[PDB]
Design a protein around this ligand. Structure first.
Ligand SMILES: CC(=O)N[C@@H]1[C@@H](O[C@@H]2O[C@@H](C)[C@@H](O)[C@@H](O)[C@@H]2O)[C@H](O[C@@H]2O[C@H](CO)[C@H](O)[C@H](O[C@H]3O[C@H](CO)[C@H](O)[C@H](O)[C@H]3NC(C)=O)[C@H]2O[C@@H]2O[C@@H](C)[C@@H](O)[C@@H](O)[C@@H]2O)[C@@H](CO)O[C@@H]1O
Ligand SMILES: CC(=O)N[C@@H]1[C@@H](O[C@@H]2O[C@@H](C)[C@@H](O)[C@@H](O)[C@@H]2O)[C@H](O[C@@H]2O[C@H](CO)[C@H](O)[C@H](O[C@H]3O[C@H](CO)[C@H](O)[C@H](O)[C@H]3NC(C)=O)[C@H]2O[C@@H]2O[C@@H](C)[C@@H](O)[C@@H](O)[C@@H]2O)[C@@H](CO)O[C@@H]1O
Ligand SMILES: CC(=O)N[C@@H]1[C@@H](O[C@@H]2O[C@@H](C)[C@@H](O)[C@@H](O)[C@@H]2O)[C@H](O[C@@H]2O[C@H](CO)[C@H](O)[C@H](O[C@H]3O[C@H](CO)[C@H](O)[C@H](O)[C@H]3NC(C)=O)[C@H]2O[C@@H]2O[C@@H](C)[C@@H](O)[C@@H](O)[C@@H]2O)[C@@H](CO)O[C@@H]1O
Ligand SMILES: CC(=O)N[C@@H]1[C@@H](O[C@@H]2O[C@@H](C)[C@@H](O)[C@@H](O)[C@@H]2O)[C@H](O[C@@H]2O[C@H](CO)[C@H](O)[C@H](O[C@H]3O[C@H](CO)[C@H](O)[C@H](O)[C@H]3NC(C)=O)[C@H]2O[C@@H]2O[C@@H](C)[C@@H](O)[C@@H](O)[C@@H]2O)[C@@H](CO)O[C@@H]1O
Ligand code: GAL
Ligand code: GAL
Ligand code: GAL
Ligand code: NA
Lengths: 103, 103, 103, 103, 103
């Protein structure tokens, strides 16, 4: 079991760590059918998605997907610094797999 | 996959972007039968709803509809600036499909 | 579809609006059996309830009832001004059908 | 329907009101199997639990038990003043039936 | 029924108490498949997980696992002092069973 985001991220193919150390600049969420997703940006232009739940997801991921959107909204509203994101780099925008918050 | 609200909104019919760049002026929520909904207004008079779930919605939207009402409530209470809303313009008041927040 | 709480309230018999323009003074919550409910009071003012779900609540209302209790709690804690309540006024304390928040 | 915690508490057997008029001193929660519970304390030594869901609960009470733990956590974190607790006094620690909050 | 985290922790095998008396230094969470977990750290290097839900958990522990991740996230954001953790010491990082917050 990994003990940090960077080691977690290394367990997966097509992932990488983005180091932001910054608050979220914008938070966008949609309820439109087939686009039940969130999108975040940082002021450097970095853009990330929480993907719409789908066949690339297993059942254990559904609750975690909803939690991640919860986390992004509250981080946004509190202006919490995001340390790192583990993202899938084979999607545009890159898709979030994990987040770390630290000063 | 869209990277912002404007591109997402353009994937649907009968939708438009309203640019508010303002906090929500009032938040109304109802539990009354057949009107289980939320209504928001802005100081310019713009009024929007999250629709009562109905025949126009699918199962994959159910959680997202509940999430949007959560997001509007906490945006209202915290005075969070709403950047844009994507809305269906064939409902009165216009019905929210997506929101973006940015300072 | 109504665009404000007053018009919504006018769609139902046995309701009225109370105009409060004040924060909630006290919040009471019970998990005791058959009293799973929330009660709010306004300073030097009235008490209101969210009814226990039962016979006279249809099924889409169950989530809305839970949401309303969540709304009253967060309003109380954040000290947000309640603008108006739409209530059923056939018993004391009057039962909440809808809430509006505005400054 | 009772309009305050004291009158609510009087509808049950083996309950009583403790008056605190104080913030929560400590908050404890557990996910250990068969001990999925919460405990709170006050600086006068008063200690209360939210019981593990069990045979003594009817099914409407499950959501309410979860709500109470939500309430106690955010009360603790925000240092919200707890006015009174209605508790079952046939358990150690006394088990929470209801709470009232007032500043 | 225990009245505190230490006595709760002593009801189980392979558990121990870590006394921190400090805020959380970092909070990490993941939606990646088979690693739907949270990780927290403290400035002294202590690292703890909320385990991926699995065969070692009963249904009552499921909601409690989700609650604990909620608790850790808001504790982190609010700089809440964590008093103690009860953890399983047969997992690496040690796996949280219970938390207490005080002071
Ligand atoms: C809306 C938009 O188009 N914005 C882009 C940025 O891309 C968006 O955000 C990124 C994170 C992805 O989600 C994109 O899909 C999304 O459109 C764009 O950022 C660069 O995007 C690249 C996409 O492949 C890549 O992620 C890149 O970073 C990696 O590659 C660069 C070299 O180009 C460096 O080697 C980086 O170190 C490397 N990072 C990692 C973790 O491997 C992104 O660029 C990096 O992030 C930017 C936010 C910015 O800080 C860059 O200096 C940095 O290199 C940027 C590119 O400038 O433009 C638009 O803002
Ligand atoms: C409670 C009430 O009746 N309030 C009205 C506004 O209508 C409400 O809010 C709007 C946003 C919709 O949700 C309505 O269903 C709702 O009742 C009303 O706003 C205008 O509403 C029009 C629909 O009836 C329409 O949406 C219009 O915007 C479009 O058309 C205008 C012409 O008026 C312009 O061409 C706009 O560019 C165009 N916008 C887009 C994105 O397509 C709304 O008017 C605009 O928004 C207003 C809030 C205000 O800023 C206007 O200056 C602006 O044009 C307003 C209209 O005055 O009156 C009450 O406030
Ligand atoms: C961890 C621990 O053991 N703490 C105890 C206190 O007990 C804990 O908290 C109480 C509220 C219960 O939930 C217990 O289950 C729990 O372990 C203990 O408080 C007294 O607890 C009694 C029950 O064991 C009882 O509730 C008592 O108050 C009642 O009785 C007294 C005299 O015995 C008076 O009649 C009170 O009016 C009566 N209260 C009511 C509402 O009927 C508790 O003591 C009262 O509250 C204490 C917090 C404190 O302010 C006392 O001065 C006050 O009498 C205390 C006190 O013995 O010891 C440990 O802190
Ligand atoms: C990322 C990393 O490698 N970090 C390690 C610490 O381990 C992490 O945190 C601990 C709490 C566990 O969850 C690990 O699984 C996790 O990787 C590491 O902490 C020590 O970890 C040991 C188990 O691997 C063990 O728990 C130890 O505590 C016990 O043994 C020590 C002496 O080594 C003392 O006797 C303690 O009293 C005893 N504790 C109990 C409750 O029985 C951990 O060390 C303790 O906690 C540290 C955070 C630090 O304050 C030490 O002074 C203290 O002894 C530390 C060890 O330095 O290194 C990395 O930070
Ligand atoms: O998914 C919700 C949407 O469904 C469409 O059919 C309708 O025209 C929109 O106004 C909106 O209700
Ligand atoms: O509903 C929960 C309650 O159930 C009662 O029967 C019991 O006597 C109380 O102590 C409390 O457990
Ligand atoms: O309930 C969860 C616990 O299950 C036990 O069997 C195991 O020893 C612990 O590591 C922990 O996973
Ligand atoms: Na009416």
């Amino acid at each position: 079991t990994p003990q940090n985001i960077t080691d977690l991220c290394a367990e997966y193919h097509n992932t990488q760590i983005h180091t932001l150390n910054d608050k979220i600049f914008s938070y966008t969420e949609s309820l439109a059918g087939k686009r039940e997703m969130a999108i975040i940006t940082f002021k450097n232009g970095a853009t990330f998605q929480v993907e719409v739940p789908g066949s690339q997801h297993i059942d254990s991921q559904k609750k975690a997907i909803e939690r991640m959107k919860d986390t992004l909204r509250i981080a946004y509203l509190t202006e919490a610094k995001v340390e790192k994101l583990c993202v899938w780099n084979n999607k545009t925008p890159h898709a979030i797999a994990a987040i770390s918050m630290a000063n």
